[model samples]
Target: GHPFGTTVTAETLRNTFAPLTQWEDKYRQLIMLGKQLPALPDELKAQAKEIAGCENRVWLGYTVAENGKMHFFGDSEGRIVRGLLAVLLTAVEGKTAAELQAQSPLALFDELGLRAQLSASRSQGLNALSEAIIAAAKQV
Candidate 1:
C-alpha cells in the first residue's frame, strides 16, 4: 500500500517523515514511496503533460472523479525523481479544487529534510508541479 493517498493525511505524513534520524534512510524511504505510483500510460505521457524545469523529464496528470476529488498520476525518468513526485503527490493530490489552498509543497519538502539535498532544478520542478496542480484544480 502507498504511504499516503486519498486516505493519508498531511499530519500523518509529517509524523512519518519527521522521525527518521538518518538522511540515507529518508532518501531510501522516498525512493520506495516513489515506486508506489503507477506509470502514466504512453498516450497520456504527451508533451502536454510534461512538466518543465525539472532536472529530468517528468509528467503529471489529474482528473476529477465523480466524488469530486481530483486524482493524480505522475511519472519521471529517474527513480529518485519518481520518489520526489510521490512526496509531492502525498501533499497535494486527492483533494477538491478548493481544498487545495496551500501554495507550495515546500512545507512538506522542508519537513522531509529535502531542501538542502534537492537540486535547484528539481526544486523549481516541485514549484512547477504545485502550480500545475493549482491550475488543474481550477480548470475543471
Candidate 2:
C-alpha cells in the first residue's frame, strides 16, 4: 500500500503522464481524468466551507480514509478548472500537513506543463487550490 503522508514528486507525475505529449492532448486527458474523482458528500458542500478565491465556483471536500490517508474531491463548472483541482489533489492526497508543506506545487506545475499552458486566471485558481489544501491539512 502507498505510504501515508508520502510526498508526490514531479518525476512521478511526469511518468504518470508519459503516454501524452501535446498540451491539448494532455488537457483532454486531464478532463477525462477529472471525471473519475470520487464524489464529494453533500454535507461537505456547504457554502461556508467552499474555496472562495477561485474565479469559478469550487467545492472541496476531504475525508480521512480508514488507513489514515486523506482523500480529496473537488468540482467546478469550468473544464480546465476541475483539471487544475485534480492536479492539486494528486499532490496532496494521502498526505499530512508536514508532507503537504514540504512539497512544491509551483515546481510540480512547471513539470506538468500547466504553468506554461494555463491562463493567468487559471494559474491564480491553481494557487488558490493549493492554499485551500494546505489550510485543510493544517486543520487535520
Candidate 3:
C-alpha cells in the first residue's frame, strides 16, 4: 500500500524534505509517511523477531521477487521509528542482493539530514535494521 521504495524513491523523499527547512515540517512529514505502511499481521509480527537496538519494538518482514529483488516490510511501535523504517525501505526495496549488499542505509539517512537528527540509540537501531537487511541479502 505504501509508495516508498517504488513510486516514492530516495530522490522523492530528498526533494520533498528539501523544501521543509523547519524540523517541525519535516517531523510532520515523517509522521505522515509512517501512516502509509501496511499493518503487519499479529501472528506474522510475532514471528518477525523484533530487531535489537531499537528502544521501541520493531519487526521486519520481507520477500524476494522472482527477479531476485528483495522487498522489505516493517513496523515499529513508535511513529517516528515507523517513519524511519519507511525511509530505510526506500533504499532497500526492489533492489538486487548485490545492490542491497553494497548499499549503506546510514549514508542514505545522512543524506536525508536524518542521521544528525536521530538519537544515538535510534541511529544504532537504524544501523541494526540495515545490517539485518544486508545479512538477509547475503543469504539470497
Candidate 4:
C-alpha cells in the first residue's frame, strides 16, 4: 500500500531513526526507509522533477488523496538523499494543510545525528526536501 493513505507518520520517523546510535545504522535505516515509499512513476520523475537549490539530484511530487490528505513521492540518484526524502515524506504525507503550514523546515529536520554529520550542501538538500514537502501540503 502507499505510505500516505492512513499509515506512515512523523513519529514513524522518530521511532525509526531516533534510536539509531551509529551513523552507519542511521544511514542503513535511511536507505531502507527510502525503499518503503512507493516509487514515483517514471514520467513524474523526469529531470524537471528535481528539487532545486540542492547540489545532488532529488525528484519529488505529490497527489492529494480524495480525503484531502496529501501524499508525497520522491526519488534520488543519491541513496542518502533518497533516504532523507523518505524520512521527510513520512513527515508530510497523509497530513492536513494546517498541520504542514505550521511546521518549520529546520525544526522538522531534527536529527538522528544525520544532518549534523552532513556537509553544508547536503544539509541544504535535506532542508530543501523538507521545505518542498511542506510547500506541497500548503499548495493543496
Best by lDDT: 3
Name the better of 1 and 2 by TM-score.
1
Q: What lDDT is obtained when candidate 2 is compared to the true structure?
A: 0.65
Cα RMSD to native, each candidate? Answer: 2.6, 4.3, 1.5, 2.7
48-135, model 4: which lDDT tens digit per residue? 2577857667787777776877666777777777777766666666777777778764554575456767667877787677777676
Over the stretch 71-125, how does candidate 3's per-residue lDDT look in tens digits? 7777888888888888988888888888876767666777777766667898878
How do the candidates rank by TM-score, highest first? 3, 1, 4, 2
What is candidate 2's lDDT per residue for 23-119, written digit by digit as tens? Answer: 8887886676566554555655663246666777888767666565666766676766766666676677676666777876455666666676677
- Top candidate on TM-score is 3
Q: Clash totals for all models, in order? A: 0, 0, 0, 0
Cα miss at 77, model 4 (Å)?
Answer: 1.0
TM-scores for every predicted model? 0.82, 0.74, 0.91, 0.79
User: Where in model 2 is the C-alpha error above 4 Å?
Assistant: 1-13, 16-19, 65-68
lDDT of 1 by residue, 13-114 (tens): 667678876778778877877777777778777634788878889988877887888777778888778888887888777778877765555568887687
User: Global lDDT of each model?
Assistant: 0.75, 0.65, 0.81, 0.69
TM-score: model 4 vs. ground truth: 0.79
Candidate 1, residue 85: how far the Cα is off, in Å: 0.5
